[PDB]
């Protein structure tokens, strides 16, 4: 809710409304893909976020080394 | 040794086969030397043959190991048994085959032993062998480049062959047309390029120009080569005189003209220095290649990429010639037109007077030497064009005030100041021209001179105005007329510009003193172009120095102009000569002198051999002092010569300022002031540490003007690192103080060192190239030498009129913007194999904006690898363009 | 060619004969040199006098100031002194400081360390090219990598690769591994630099990275260059408990070479040829693909082989027909290239001990015993087969 | 011709007899002197000669007490250790010597000219440092799915703060590169580097480790700080496990000169301050050594794993490396790639590096077939199980 | 250290990420199916031609009426076959029924991951399988052919392709393959594409050629049918 | 830096030692501390300079 006012948030997903999928995060966590959510938002050119950079944020904190959702389908 | 091998047929041989030819081999040795020789050739050439193939065999095998203990003695003794009788003799199929391999064992030695006897000699045997092979030597070096492995030593060893062709001891034309030096460019770059420069083997590159430019694209370095052939050519004058290179560079020039690579044909056509050679470099960039592409515009750019000397166009012989040509290259006739016209090199100038700000704090202040002091000043701080706008437009404080020869002088700064406006400072010079004395009329004809050539490219130009003012009556208006005449068009061939230098100066009988800058403006004319050959210069000079050489001043400058109008030619001084020698006098015969001196003058071996015949050393009366100082100096040379040859300027340069003091005693004083500006002329390579050196000792030695002359070389590459060198230079002028007189010269020295930043650069160098001419460096260079320096002498002595463009970025596919634009770095650099110095197109990318510098900047090129493309202006940034060609007629590079 | 001669000669004719000319000459005539000449000369002379403090120039500041720490036990932040340049001192070299005052007088000196003198190792082996017969392959490997982008770079750095770097040595130990880096090392004429891996990692505390950086740096100055390090594996195998430096120690060193190797810093002409062991023993750290583009394993040397070294060694050693060559090979396995030099210097050795000069049959009989069994030793082998 | 060349052989005598007459004048030996910066200086410099100002004694201030006798005075402590009052020359004012800073005092005569610029005491750090190198572009695989990752966080700040504040975001601080040795952390980080042209200033921390524990400590805390203060400012931390490695000691041993340094480090980052907007990237050579202060968000805000470069990676990189050079183009070149084993972006080009080196030998102005079957087959069996990730992957 | 038995700090298993890329070392398979049988073409994988054709087994008959082809790893697949012909069989005995290819492909992707090395035995796994299978067969419904892989997703296929590079395999079929087409340019689409995933030549001994057609058993091409596949490339 | 000086006072002897009671804190690990020592020193020794076929340190 603090975060908001500052930078824009989707309306389809709010980290509070992602938490309850998924299990307990740490407060720094909640900022730290709120943060990067907007990164790919900027990077875009656009000021809105939407439910995709916030997902993408998820796998963003995650380490990679075969890229794949496909082989983990 | 291990005898036998191939000439065994056991399984077990094979070993010993590839090490045999270093000792000595049972027959096949004999098959070329014995065997050929004692039985006749028919019962042989069975045996032969067979023999002959196992021999090829063995290259191919001794290529396979990659030891040179191998390689080298077994090639070696093969080589004696072919000499001897299988040359020419045994048949007509037979010698080009024995043939074949005798090239690949001559090639280690040719390039091993550097010599020159060793040099010599294998051009004898390698032209011989060409003519009779017939072509095989193409095919060889094709094999050998594909093989399946081969030694690191053969790479240097076959290009080293190519040179046997080249000397022409046994050829004529006969295979002077590759030894497929195709591939062998592309694998390395380094003696293929001496052997065709010589050869005149370089037309042939322009048909196989097609091929290459996929090389030179992303995949290797094609165009390093080509760049390093144009290197040799201009080297070639060091090497063996200015006579024998002027044919070769004529020849070398249509060859680049027609290549893609533009710079290296623009070099060329500067040094020869002739009407017809500039309008073709324009015409065939556009006829060669038919495509849109950057061809059309390279010779427009090519122009703008030229930076020798003066303003806009900068050379000028250039700025006439490429119209007419201008209708029939058609990009389109209203934008070439618009493009060419100095009207658009103009505007882009305004936006860089932002960036660099106020500089002045200077005096305006009235009344004593300070009012003079004060004109040289507001100009020394901004030097070229800055800020320094609100200062001119103020009439009232500086220009007015003063008195006498003062307010010629400035006047006259004014218009530097003013330079590169299209219009505005026009507006301000015409205003003064109308008001005040005499004095304020004519130095306003300079400084008119410098503005007008703003509207120009033969459509209202800068000649049209100055014809008018020509005219006048007075002897101070005209001469300042005719100075800024001279100025504008600085080295030209014009019909206009040469019939108004016909009748001015036609007495040696005037009222003022400062008549003789007519001869120099005169002489200025001459060189950069196709010589003016006017009458009035050189009959007058001899006349004057018989009623006068009380006047140190007036003495001095006819003579100058004389041995100025003859050089840029050794053939057109004859026509004006023929007439002088009617008129006879003591005078003449040291006139005459000077024409043998002028013709011989820019060759790097008989000009110095010329210095202990001197005319410096004596003094016949005082006829022989005027002239002494100038042959010491080798500016021009200095200048027209390589980037290679700079290195060693940098001694030649001091070495003549010794030469004077040597010789004269009072010389010894003006050859230190001439220093500084000689230094300006030279551009040398390294710029940091001669200005500085002499800047502290100038201030103990008599005459302080040597100190104002030193400035001007001075600040160099204007504040980054230069910071520490202007405010050192400007405090040791200032901490000294003993009189008004002193002062000034100090004061004049203080404020032009000190340079607000990113500001204009001292260069009269072409920004890739340290090579060029000067012809406007010579409007203070003349007045550098007259003993004990007028408050009428500084005026003239006062104008830059120079320095760089602002655009080191794309003109491109017609751009012309200082808006940033990319470019890509090697940190790790591979080349010094390119003349101009621009490190691969495999980039690491980086951010925008390449503005002015004028040392470094070496390794800074335009990215070829974000949609890859290869650099047809070598980027530098100096003045040097970030452009590309590439097959798209836009660029693929866009704008930071 | 012989016209570049020409030219490169023109700069250095000048440079001799204008120095000359202008020192003497200029004080001779009017006011140029002159007075200021005379005064740096006698400044710099008379500030220096006696004594001199030695110090070491730590950095160089841009304000006509530097750091300097010198040999008396104190730093400065010296002035510098009237006609003096302080962009002439090296960061590499040490500079002479007037003792009285501290401000530098001048660089008479660079000085020398002990440190330096490791690295610098000269070679003139007794074995060396063309004492080595049979594995002709694995030679000629060696050379494809070293050799060739080394003596001529400019293709192999414009191509678009870095140039291809050294080789790693494995396999059975004892093939004469140490006989070809310093044999090859002679025919491309590259300066030898020999520094061992255990020698790294000692008692002194940071001491250990420095060196190496030292190392690479002397390497890259000599300018053709290969760095044999002999017995790198030790690293690796074992971890020390010895060193006051401890487990530390051996982290910091590690990462080091690979930072002075290419790293950010990307030396070039620098190869390095590493032997070891195996390199199943050596440190998953420094060992990776893409330093070092080619690997050689060498094979168990044959019978074969075996002969062409022996005749060289041979031809070295007292000659008779009491030497047998031939039986030595034979009796033995399929094993190592050192053997046939351990036999041979073992036979000389032998000799001394019977207050005899000669190598003769029976010494050579007694010394295939010891050699065997030292080394790998048949009989446990014998069951297996 | 023949003279010209006699000049060649003489020209190294004529150097060497000279040598007292050129030292003086040029530099180097005796009496060395420049001529063309020493002397353009020479009249400020009398003004030092005259002072005292010679020697300044390198030291830090600790606290600006002044007191009688001679009125204007500080109490330093040398860089030796060691502390001495000294006293004020008349060239600076009181205010310009400030409690903590550096400054330079005498040895002869105990007082401040000029203060000495605060710090720059390592050395042994700026021995490693070149400011925006890079072995080519090309060898990167140009642009992959790791390198467009990395710029996000990296680029974007430093070039524009500007869109960060308008958004309304919060900056970034910390990435952490890992993997095994040659899976290029340093080479991907150098080449965003160059992108965003920030100055670069990379560093390894085997260097700002040196004599005993606490000394390499002082040197992590300034130049951290130093870089901090500097605007636009790219810190790219190389190999770290020598201010990076495990945290215990077991009273046998002890990592503890090491953790002194790496806590110093993780401490500075982002502070006990809000955060900066200047960039930290750590390149670690193991995830098993990290300690839980170094991983918090807001001093490392995503980990991206650059280990064993991925399915697009392998491919990108040999065909980028093959653009670049003169190879036949009837090969595929992600063929060769895909049969390279579990590859490290290290062993990818191996194969490109080893493929080359066989058509240079030739000398062709292409490659064959053959030179690349050779490599790729000796790749696949002898190097990858000899590469630095089977053993360091399963640690990790 | 830990085990391969952990997860990655990505949040995935370390033993089935090094399996895929096992595979990639090895041989190719391609199946073609098409509505008139299902082709198999697969590398013997040879040194020389000299190496006896005469059983050389890489594409072996799980039942009368499905055929396989394997790819990958080429030792651990010979067990994950020989194991496959004993299950499908035990279907095909109690059913009586001529096996679907879908059924086949299911039972075989859960033993693909049973790794650890904690809960398990001999008879169980240790590590996971890099062998990823293509089972081509005719049933009741018509042709069909499933690819399995070691992450057990099974997938329908009208062509799948999985080799040397299994990326490259791939794309060379989309290229040639189009959804309606003959047998006979099925096979020789097979082929062209084998060479592109090999980076091994064409010979006769070097490939092996089986097809399961409508009302036809699995077959085993001999070397004259071996070569008149060859000519159609 | 060891074999120059002592070959200037030749002939020399470098002298390693173990009794295992001092330096008994340096014996395990790497198995003695005195190992590393002996097997640095031998590999330089084998060849620098002309030494390989002279001897005088020991």
Same mark, same amino acid.
């Given at each position: ?73 | ?896 | ?385 | ?185 340093? $080479?991907? !980080? *150098?080449?965003?580097? &160059?992108? /965003?042209? @920030?100055?670069?200033?990379? +560093? ?130 992600? $063929?060769? !790639? *895909?049969?390279?084993? &579990?590859? /490290?972006? @290290?062993?990818?080009?191996? +194969? ?45 | ?233 | ?58």
């Amino acid at each position: 809710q603090i975060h908001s006012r500052k930078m824009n948030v989707s309306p389809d997903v709010n980290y509070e409304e992602l938490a309850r999928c998924t299990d307990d995060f740490n407060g720094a966590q909640c900022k730290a893909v709120c943060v990067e959510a907007g990164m790919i938002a900027l990077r875009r050119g656009a000021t809105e976020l939407t439910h995709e950079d916030y997902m993408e944020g998820i796998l963003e904190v995650q380490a990679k080394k075969k890229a794949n959702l496909q082989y983990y389908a | 040794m291990e005898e036998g091998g191939r000439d065994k047929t056991p399984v077990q041989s094979q070993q010993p086969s590839a090490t045999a030819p270093s000792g000595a081999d049972e027959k096949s040795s004999g098959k070329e030397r014995r065997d050929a020789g004692e039985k006749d050739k028919e019962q042989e050439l069975s045996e032969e043959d067979k023999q002959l193939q196992d021999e090829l065999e063995m290259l191919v095998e001794r290529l396979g190991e990659k030891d040179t203990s191998l390689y080298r003695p077994a090639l070696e003794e093969l080589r004696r048994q072919i000499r001897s009788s299988t040359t020419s003799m045994t048949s007509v199929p037979k010698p080009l085959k024995f043939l074949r391999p005798h090239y690949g064992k001559l090639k280690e030695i040719y390039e091993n032993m550097a010599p020159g006897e060793n040099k010599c000699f294998a051009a004898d045997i390698i032209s011989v062998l060409a003519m009779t092979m017939s072509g095989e030597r193409e095919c060889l070096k094709y094999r050998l480049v594909g093989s399946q492995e081969e030694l690191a030593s053969w790479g240097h060893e076959y290009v080293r062959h190519l040179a046997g062709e080249v000397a022409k001891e046994w050829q004529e034309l006969d295979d002077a047309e590759k030894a497929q030096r195709e591939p062998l460019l592309t694998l390395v770059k380094e003696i293929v390029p001496y052997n065709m420069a010589h050869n005149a083997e370089h037309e042939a590159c322009d048909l196989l120009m097609e091929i290459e430019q996929v090389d030179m694209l992303e995949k290797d370095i094609d165009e390093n080569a080509y760049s390093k052939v144009c290197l040799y050519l201009t080297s070639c004058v060091n090497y063996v005189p200015e006579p024998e290179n002027s044919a070769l560079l004529r020849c070398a020039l249509g060859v680049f003209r027609k290549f893609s690579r533009f710079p290296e044909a623009l070099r060329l056509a500067l040094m020869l220095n002739d009407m017809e050679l500039v309008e073709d470099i324009f015409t065939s960039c556009k006829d060669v290649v038919v495509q849109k592409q950057m061809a059309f515009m390279l010779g427009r750019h090519g122009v703008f990429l030229e930076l020798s000397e003066d303003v806009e166009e900068y050379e000028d012989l250039t700025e006439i010639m490429s119209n007419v040509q201008l209708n029939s290259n058609f990009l389109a006739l209203a934008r070439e037109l618009d493009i060419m016209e100095p009207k658009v090199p103009d505007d882009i100038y305004k936006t860089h007077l932002e960036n660099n700000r106020f500089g002045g704090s200077g005096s305006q202040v009235d009344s004593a030497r300070m009012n003079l002091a004060s004109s040289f000043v507001n100009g020394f701080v901004n030097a070229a064009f800055g800020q320094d706008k609100l200062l001119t437009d103020d009439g009232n404080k500086w220009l007015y005030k003063n008195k006498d020869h003062g307010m010629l002088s400035a006047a006259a700064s004014l218009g530097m100041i003013l330079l590169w406006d299209v219009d505005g400072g026009l507006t301000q010079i015409d205003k003064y021209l109308y008001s005040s004395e005499d004095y304020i009329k004519s130095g306003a004809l300079l400084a008119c001179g410098i503005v007008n050539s703003g509207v120009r490219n033969e459509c209202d130009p800068a000649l049209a105005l100055l014809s008018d003012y020509v005219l006048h009556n007075s002897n101070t208006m005209r001469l300042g007329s005719i100075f800024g005449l001279g100025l504008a068009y600085a080295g030209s061939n014009r019909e206009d510009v040469l019939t108004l230098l016909l009748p001015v100066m036609g007495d040696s009988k005037s009222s003022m003193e400062v008549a003789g800058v007519t001869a120099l403006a005169c002489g200025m004319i001459a060189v950069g172009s196709c010589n003016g050959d006017v009458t009035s210069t050189i009959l007058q000079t001899i006349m004057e120095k018989s009623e006068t050489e009380l006047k140190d001043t007036y003495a001095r400058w006819l003579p100058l102009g004389l041995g100025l109008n003859h050089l840029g030619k050794g053939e057109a001084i004859e026509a004006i000569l023929a007439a002088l020698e009617v008129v006879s006098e003591p005078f003449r015969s040291f006139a005459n002198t000077l024409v043998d001196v002028c013709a011989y003058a820019g060759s790097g071996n008989v000009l110095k051999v010329q210095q202990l015949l001197h005319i410096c050393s004596e003094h016949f009366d005082s006829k022989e002092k005027e002239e002494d100082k100038d042959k010491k100096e080798k500016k021009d040379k200095d200048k027209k010569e390589a980037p290679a040859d700079m290195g060693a300027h940098q001694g030649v340069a001091v070495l003549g300022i010794a030469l004077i003091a040597m010789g004269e005693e009072i010389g010894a004083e003006m050859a230190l002031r001439t220093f500084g500006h000689l230094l300006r002329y030279g551009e040398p390579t390294l710029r940091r540490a001669v200005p500085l050196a002499l800047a502290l000792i100038s201030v103990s030695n008599p005459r302080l003007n040597i100190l104002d002359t030193l400035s001007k070389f001075s600040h160099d590459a204007d504040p980054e690192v230069s910071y520490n060198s202007i405010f050192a230079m400007g405090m040791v002028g200032s901490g000294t103080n003993n009189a008004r007189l002193a002062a000034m010269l100090r004061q004049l020295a203080q404020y032009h060192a000190k340079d607000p930043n990113n500001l204009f650069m001292v260069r009269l160098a072409q920004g890739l190239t340290h090579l060029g001419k000067g012809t406007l460096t010579l409007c203070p260079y003349h007045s550098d030498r007259q003993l004990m320096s007028q408050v009428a002498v500084a005026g003239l002595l006062t104008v830059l009129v120079s320095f760089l463009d602002v655009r080191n970025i794309i003109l491109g596919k017609s751009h012309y913007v200082l808006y940033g634009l990319v470019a890509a770095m090697q940190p790790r650099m591979l080349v010094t194999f390119d003349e101009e110095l621009r490190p691969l197109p495999v980039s690491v990318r980086v951010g925008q904006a390449v503005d002015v510098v004028g040392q470094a900047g070496k390794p800074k090129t335009i990215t070829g690898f974000q949609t890859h493309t290869t650099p047809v202006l070598l980027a530098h940034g100096e003045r040097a363009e970030l452009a590309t060609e590439e097959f798209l007629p836009v660029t693929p590079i866009l704008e930071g | 060619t012989q016209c570049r001669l020409k030219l490169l000669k023109l700069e250095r004719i000048k440079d001799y004969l204008l120095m000359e000319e202008e020192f003497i000459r200029n004080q001779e005539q009017m006011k140029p040199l002159e007075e200021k000449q005379e005064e740096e000369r006698s400044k710099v002379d008379d500030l220096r006098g006696t004594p001199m403090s030695v110090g070491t120039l730590e950095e160089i500041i841009d304000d006509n100031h530097a750091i300097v720490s010198t040999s008396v036990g104190s730093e400065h932040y010296v002035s510098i002194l009237s006609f003096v340049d302080k962009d002439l001192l090296e960061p590499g070299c040490s500079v002479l400081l007037n003792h009285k005052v501290h401000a530098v007088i001048g660089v008479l000196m660079d000085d020398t360390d002990p440190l330096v003198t490791v690295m610098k190792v000269e070679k003139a082996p007794q074995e060396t090219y063309a004492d080595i017969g049979g594995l002709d392959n694995q030679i000629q490997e060696i050379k494809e990598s070293v050799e060739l982008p080394l003596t001529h770079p400019e293709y192999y750095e414009e191509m678009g690769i870095k140039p291809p770097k050294g080789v790693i040595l494995y396999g059975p130990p004892g093939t004469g591994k140490t006989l070809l880096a310093k044999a090859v090392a002679n025919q491309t004429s590259a300066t030898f630099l020999r520094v061992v891996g255990s020698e790294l990692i000692q008692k002194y505390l940071g001491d250990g990275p420095k060196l190496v950086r030292e190392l690479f740096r002397v390497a890259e100055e000599h300018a053709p260059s290969i760095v044999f390090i002999d017995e790198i594996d030790a690293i690796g195998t074992k971890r020390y408990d010895s060193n006051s430096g401890g487990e530390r120690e051996i982290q910091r060193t590690m990462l080091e070479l690979l930072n002075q190797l290419d790293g950010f810093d990307s030396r070039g002409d620098v190869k390095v040829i590493m032997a070891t062991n195996r390199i199943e023993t050596l440190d998953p750290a420094l060992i990776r693909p893409g330093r070092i583009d080619r690997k050689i394993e060498f094979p168990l040397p044959d019978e074969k082989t075996k002969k062409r070294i022996f005749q060289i060694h041979t031809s070295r050693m007292t000659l008779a027909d009491d030497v047998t060559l031939d039986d030595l090979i034979m009796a033995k396995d399929d094993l190592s290239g050192a053997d046939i030099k351990a036999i041979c210097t073992e036979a000389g050795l032998m000799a001394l001990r019977e207050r005899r000069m000669k190598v003769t049959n029976e010494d050579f009989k007694k010394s295939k015993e010891n050699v065997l069994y030292k080394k790998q030793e048949g009989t446990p082998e014998g069951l297996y087969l | 011709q023949s003279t010209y060349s006699r000049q060649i052989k003489q020209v190294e005598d004529d150097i060497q007899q000279l040598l007292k007459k050129i030292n003086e004048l040029t530099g180097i030996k005796e009496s060395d002197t420049g001529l063309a910066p020493p002397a353009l200086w020479d009249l400020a410099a009398d003004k030092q000669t005259l002072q005292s100002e010679q020697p300044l004694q390198v030291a830090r201030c600790t606290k600006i007490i002044n007191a009688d006798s001679e009125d204007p005075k500080y109490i330093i402590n040398v860089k030796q250790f060691a502390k001495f009052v000294v006293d004020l020359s008349d060239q600076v004012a009181p205010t310009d010597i400030e409690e903590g800073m550096r400054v330079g005092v005498d040895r002869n005569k105990y007082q401040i000219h000029i203060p000495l610029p605060p710090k720059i005491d390592p050395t042994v750090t700026m021995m490693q440092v070149e400011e925006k190198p890079d072995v080519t572009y090309s060898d990167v695989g140009g642009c992959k799915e790791q390198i467009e990752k990395l710029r996000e966080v990296v680029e974007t700040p430093l070039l524009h703060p500007e869109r960060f504040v308008n958004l309304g975001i919060e900056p970034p601080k910390g990435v952490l590169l890992f993997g095994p040795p040659g899976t290029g952390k340093t $080479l991907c !980080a *150098r080449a965003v580097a &160059n992108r /965003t042209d @920030a100055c670069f200033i990379p +560093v390894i921390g085997s260097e700002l480790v040196q004599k005993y524990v606490g000394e390499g400590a002082r040197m992590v805390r300034e130049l951290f700080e130093m870089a901090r203060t500097k605007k636009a400012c790219l810190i790219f931390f190389d190999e770290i496990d020598a201010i990076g490695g495990a945290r215990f000691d077991d009273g046998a041993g002890g990592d503890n000169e090491v953790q002194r340094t790496m806590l110093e480090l993780i401490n500075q980052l982002d502070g006990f301050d809000p955060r900066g907007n200047i960039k930290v990237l750590m390149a670690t050579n193991r995830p098993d050594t990290l300690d839980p202060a170094l991983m918090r968000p807001g001093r490392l805000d995503r980990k991206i794993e650059f280990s064993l470069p991925d399915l697009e990676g392998r491919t990108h990189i040999f065909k980028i490396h093959a653009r670049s050079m003169s190879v036949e183009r009837d090969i595929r070149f992600e $063929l060769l !790639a *895909r049969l390279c084993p &579990n590859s /490290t972006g @290290a062993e990818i080009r191996s +194969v490109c590096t080893e493929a080359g080196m066989f058509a240079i030998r030739a000398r062709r102005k292409i490659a064959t077939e053959k030179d690349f079957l050779e490599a790729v087959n000796k790749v696949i069996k002898s190097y990858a199980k000899f590469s630095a990730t089977p053993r360091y992957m399963t640690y990790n | 250290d830990r085990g391969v038995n952990t997860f990655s700090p990505e949040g995935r298993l370390f033993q089935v990420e090094y399996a895929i890329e096992g595979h990639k070392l090895g041989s190719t398979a391609i199946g073609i199916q098409t509505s008139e049988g299902v082709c198999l073409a697969v590398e013997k994988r040879i040194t020389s031609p000299l190496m006896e054709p005469s059983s050389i087994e890489k594409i072996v008959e799980i039942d009368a009426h499905i055929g396989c082809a394997m790819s990958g790893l080429i030792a651990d697949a010979k067990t994950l076959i020989d194991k496959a012909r004993v299950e499908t069989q035990n279907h095909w005995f109690t059913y009586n029924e001529t096996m679907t290819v879908e059924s086949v492909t299911q039972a075989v992707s859960n033993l693909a991951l049973q790794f650890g090395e904690e809960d398990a035995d001999p008879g169980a796994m240790s590590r996971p399988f890099g062998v990823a299978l293509l089972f081509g067969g005719v049933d009741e419904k018509g042709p069909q052919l499933f690819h399995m892989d070691p992450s057990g997703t099974f997938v329908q296929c009208d062509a799948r392709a999985i080799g040397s590079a299994s990326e490259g395999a791939q794309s060379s079929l989309q290229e040639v393959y189009h959804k309606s087409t003959t047998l006979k340019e099925a096979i020789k689409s097979s082929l062209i594409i084998l060479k592109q995933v090999m980076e091994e030549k064409l010979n006769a001994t070097n490939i092996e050629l089986a097809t399961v057609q409508p009302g036809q058993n699995f077959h085993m091409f001999t070397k004259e049918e071996l070569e008149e596949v060859i000519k159609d490339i | 830096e060891l074999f120059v000086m002592a070959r200037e006072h030749a002939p020399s002897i470098i002298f390693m030692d173990e009794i295992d009671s001092i330096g008994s804190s340096r014996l395990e690990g790497g198995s003695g501390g005195d190992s590393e020592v002996q097997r640095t020193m031998l590999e330089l020794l084998n060849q620098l300079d002309g030494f390989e076929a002279t001897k005088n340190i020991k």
